[PDB]
Structure formats: C-alpha cells, structure tokens
C-alpha cells in the first residue's frame, strides 16, 4: 500500500516507506491571471522539476529543538535559476519531499514543516510549530515526508530577489537513539519541485 | 562493473557517484550482455534500453539511489547529484519490492544511431548514464546488482559481421 511515485516534469521519485501527501493551506493555486500583471504573464513548464539539497546531519548529540531551515527559493543553477535572473516577477507553489534514511532499529522523531514568512522562533514557540503544514519522520515507521503548498503572499507576483515567502524547516522532536544494529548518523536530504511557475516582465540582458 | 562484478557496493565517502557508463552497445560495462551480443552483428539501432536495478541487502539496511541520463553536449560528466539532478533522472528507495526499472530513452538527432564507437574521437555521440547513491543507512557492504535488456520499441536494422576469424 505504502508505495508512492511522484512525477514532476521529466523526473520521478519512488518511495516504498511513504505515509501520504500533506496539502498545506489549500489543494491548488488561486487565480493566476490578475489585474496587476496586465495579462502579460506566461507559464514556464520547463522549470517544474526536482532539485536536491542537503539539510543537516542528524546525529545523537542534537537535543530537542534543533531547528534547521531552508528559505525557498534557494540558489538554483538550472532553468529556475535563469528564470529568477531573467524575468522580473515570478510566482510558484512548492512540492517538497524530505528523506532521512537510517534503519528500522533507530529511534527518534523529526518534525518537517513548511513555514510562511519565516521569523526566528523563541525557545518557547517551538512547542507549537505543529500549526504549520507538517509531517513526521520516524525511523520506526517511515523515511519520507511529503508536503505540498500553494503560493501565498501579500502580492500576487513576487520578486524572489527581495522576498522569499516559504521556508522548509526540520526540528528534532525526539533525539536519535541508536543501538548496535542501527545507523550511527543520519543525513537529511531534501527534494523540492516548483509547480505552476508563472513569470512576467522580462528584463534586459547582461551579455 | 570493475573487476568483473555485476554489482556496485555502497561506498562510505563524500563522493556519491556509484558508476558511470556510456550509452553505446559497445561500451565496456555492456561487453558481456546478450543485448550487445546481438547488436555487434548489426549496423544501426533505435529505441529505449531498460536497466533493472535489484537490491541485495539485508533487512536491517536501507539505501536511496538515483539514476540520471546525461545527454551529449557537456564536457565533463557530473560528479554529484546536486548537479546531475537537472537531467532526466529517477530516484528510488529500498523496501518490500527490491527492483527498479529505468528506461534509458532514445534522444538523438538522426533517427538511427551506430552501434560502434567510430574512431579515437572521445565524448560518445550518445550521452552517458550515471548511477548515484543519495544516502544509505547501515549498509556497509551490501550490494546492488545491475542488469540491462531491450525496450518495448528497440530495433536493429542492418546485418553485418565484423568479428575477425
């Protein structure tokens, strides 16, 4: 039952220890054409594909409350990187998938969430981080968290040079407990894919 | 693969490129397969080529692999998944079902392509394929067996016999 296969563009991702997909704050995009862009917007289907990233090394020394973030979008080299630098205004939702493979004899729990409009959390607010679109990663049950969120912001189109709405966040809810037959460290990798990449207002070249 | 083993072992390193081979029915990694055994007697080919990866680890070890098809045009093949992730790739985990099938597509200018590397010219006319290892958990020695077979629309065209007697 727990065999999932996510396909974006011409790339795929299969997982045999999945727990489900978590839709955060909506199931789809709002109206993409608006009165501000004056209908001079287009869609770039070539950008909607995965790109990998490295979050952190989940060791045994990190206690409750270790918070590791990734402000999206990040420094991208593919077609998305050129889109950020070539068109003035962009908008896109995210489809994020985080994997932390140990083996079934470890223990511990990761809270993987997506936070809009990141702001540094005080040691007390971290107890309510579960208000956001989130899942859990527990080597007892699963090894893959899969969240998907639309584009939400005060402006219909944004300038990702100045304002980065979403932030992927991973917190260690229960520290890793290892045995003689469990992994001694875990490496948490991320796999993110933009969806509905709309662009508007092309810029002059630097060549 | 190296030393004539059909499996690649999980490596403990910061470099996570398990293997890399040219998409050419004369490649060194395909020198023993039945598919190349046929294709050596034909002039041109066309179609998709399937690769089957089978995990052979113990129940207490996990891993997550990725295979990407790097087309021709790049000078140096990528050496890390963060960079090769932009090609046509596929990722898979290890669980109950231990097999994974990836269809190396046929993407090239001419509708048919040769089955022999022409001359001392390098950088194969068809691109490489790189099998990476994203991460692994408590799999120190456990292997991954790789096999190759024909696709749903593979086709060989012109009969020859180049083997010297």
């Amino acid at each position, epitope marked *: 039952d727990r065999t999932l296969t996510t396909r974006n563009g011409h790339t795929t991702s299969t997982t045999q220890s999945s727990v489900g997909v978590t839709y955060g704050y909506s199931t789809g995009e709002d109206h993409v054409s608006g009165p501000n862009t004056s209908g001079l917007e287009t869609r770039v289907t070539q950008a909607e594909r995965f790109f990998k990233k490295h979050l952190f090394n989940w060791t045994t020394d990190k206690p409750f409350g270790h918070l590791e973030k990734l402000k999206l979008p990040t420094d991208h080299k593919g077609v998305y990187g050129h889109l950020v630098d070539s068109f003035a205004y962009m908008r896109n939702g995210w489809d994020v998938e985080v994997s932390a493979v140990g083996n079934q004899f470890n223990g511990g729990c990761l809270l993987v969430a997506m936070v809009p409009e990141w702001k540094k959390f005080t040691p007390r607010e971290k107890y309510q981080l579960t208000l956001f679109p989130h899942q859990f990663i527990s080597p007892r049950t699963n090894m893959t968290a899969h969240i998907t969120v639309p584009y939400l912001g005060v402006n219909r189109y944004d300038q990702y040079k100045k304002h980065k709405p979403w932030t992927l966040v991973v917190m260690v809810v229960s520290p890793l407990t290892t045995s003689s037959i469990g992994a*001694t460290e875990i490496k948490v990798y991320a796999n993110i894919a933009p969806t509905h990449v709309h662009v508007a207002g092309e810029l002059p070249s630097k060549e | 693969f190296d030393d004539g083993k059909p499996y690649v072992v999980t*490596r*403990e*390193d910061e470099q996570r490129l398990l293997a890399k081979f040219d998409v050419s029915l004369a490649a060194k990694h395909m020198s023993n397969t039945y598919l190349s055994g046929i294709a050596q007697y034909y002039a041109q080919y066309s179609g998709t080529i399937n690769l089957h990866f089978m995990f052979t680890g113990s129940t207490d070890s996990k891993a997550r692999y990725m295979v990407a098809y790097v087309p021709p045009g790049v000078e140096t093949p990528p050496d890390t998944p963060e960079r090769a992730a932009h090609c046509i790739h596929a990722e898979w985990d290890t669980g109950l079902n231990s097999k994974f099938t990836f269809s190396i597509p046929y993407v090239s200018a001419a509708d048919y392509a040769y089955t022999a590397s022409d001359v001392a010219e390098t950088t194969n006319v068809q691109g490489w394929v790189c099998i990476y290892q994203i991460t692994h958990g408590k799999a*120190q020695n456990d292997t991954l067996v790789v096999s190759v077979s024909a696709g749903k629309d593979f086709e060989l065209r012109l009969p020859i016999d180049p083997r010297t007697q």
Partner: nanobody
Amino acid sequence: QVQLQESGGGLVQAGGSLRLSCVYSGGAYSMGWYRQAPGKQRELVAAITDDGITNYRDTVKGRFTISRDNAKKAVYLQMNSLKPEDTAVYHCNTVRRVATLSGSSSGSWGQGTQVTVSS
C-alpha cells in the same frame, strides 16, 4: 568537502611508539590512514568504519591500532613496535569499503604529519 587536520608525528628510535591524531569536520564517513613512503606510491595502512569494524594492511597488522571518537570527532592511530620502514608522511581522510581497503582519491589532502623512525 572536509577540513581535517593531523598531529602527533615526529622522531623516535627503533622499537618506540607514537599516537597520531586527526580531527575532521564533515559527517561520519569511514576514515583511514594513508602513508607516502619516500619514493613510493601512497598506500593505505589501516581503516575504520563508522563506529565499529577495523581493517589493517598485511605488513602493519598486529602492531598498529586504529580507534575512533565520534563525540570529539577524532581518529587515532597507535603505532607500536616501529621499524625503519615505517617512515613517511601520514595523511588521513575518507576511505571506501574498509573490507577491501580501497582508498579514495577524491580530493584535497592536508599535509600535517611527518614521522621519522631512526636506527
């Protein structure tokens, strides 16, 4: 990829002993000790896994002892019953497949340890 430093080498007579230490910064990959004999190729000596199994070269087997400390992020090589042959520069960095002992020509090395056994 990793920034790692070595220390502990020096000069000693035949039959002495030494303790080489190395400190690294990235992850928990299986480390090992390499030596470049004067005028010979760089060769692996002893390798250790991630919190566990160790493996030694044929010549240095039984006289050396490698150990790891995960908390301090350090690896140690205790050298006993030294011989004039063991003089070299003892580098340390990651190693793949400590069973077969296949070293990694991956990247940059740090030259920090020089051992000179006398006789």
